[PDB]
């Protein structure tokens, strides 16, 4: 995996989330977690494994926050 691509996709996920484009934010969050999952699979260095797993946890936190915001927004009945 390209680490530059992972960094870029985190930035885009966050930007869409900050701007209230939650649908696109979720695409990028789930997409970059898949990329980090594939990268972690290749990691043998135990120090790098621990550190990237921690990044994976933090991105999961943000992705879950967006999902829960979307659930609340969907609860606004018209």
């Amino acid at each position: 995996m390209s680490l530059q691509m992972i960094v870029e996709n985190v930035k885009l996920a966050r930007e869409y989330a900050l701007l209230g484009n939650y649908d696109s934010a979720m695409v990028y969050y789930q997409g970059v977690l898949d990329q980090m999952n594939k990268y972690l699979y290749s990691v043998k260095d135990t120090h790098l494994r621990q550190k990237w797993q921690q990044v994976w946890q933090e991105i999961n936190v943000e992705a879950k926050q967006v999902k829960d915001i979307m659930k609340t927004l969907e609860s606004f009945k018209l």
């Binding site: 680490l3 992972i6 209230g20 990044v55 936190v61 926050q65 915001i69």
Partner: protein
């Protein structure tokens, strides 16, 4: 890039993201609790009082989807928010304001025009129409200040200028 560099670049923004999204969700929950009463204007007023503009934007993106939920009174709250959004650096904020403005003009301009054209209970619908007109005139002045020269959001302001040329 090296692993350490990539991870540093990613982690640098996490704390802010967590805090911003936590606060936004808290504020949306407050607004949602008023929304479920069915009092749409009070829900929007609560969002305005909280003063989290991202929450005003999220709420307008919802209400912009159903014009039938808009009462004349709601325009007196939304019009000032439109003026604020039209001055945003974010194209999506401007677009949300433009969408709300087009909805208001299509739904309420005929009524406003009729009320203001009447000869000298009813003084409350007249009062609301007079306020909406001054607020619309304020936005008209802003759009005219921004459309004589193509700006950051030139396309949106060209369209608004033509739409409000009445």
């Amino acid at each position: 890039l090296v692993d350490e560099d990539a991870m540093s670049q990613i982690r640098k923004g996490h704390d802010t993201m967590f805090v911003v999204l936590t606060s936004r969700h808290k504020n949306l929950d407050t607004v949602r609790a008023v929304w479920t009463t069915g009092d749409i204007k009070t829900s929007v007023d609560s969002a305005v009082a909280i003063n989290d503009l991202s929450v005003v934007v999220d709420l307008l993106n919802i209400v912009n989807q159903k014009a039938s939920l808009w009462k004349l009174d709601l325009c007196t709250t939304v019009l000032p928010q439109i003026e604020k959004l039209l001055q945003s650096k974010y194209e999506s904020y401007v677009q949300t304001g433009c969408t709300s403005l087009k909805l208001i003009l299509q739904r309420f301009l005929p009524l406003i025009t009729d009320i203001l054209a009447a000869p000298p209970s009813r003084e409350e619908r007249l009062h609301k129409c007079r306020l909406c007109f001054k607020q619309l005139k304020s936005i008209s002045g802003l759009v005219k200040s921004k459309s004589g020269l193509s700006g950051r959001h030139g396309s949106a302001f060209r369209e608004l200028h033509l739409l409000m040329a009445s």
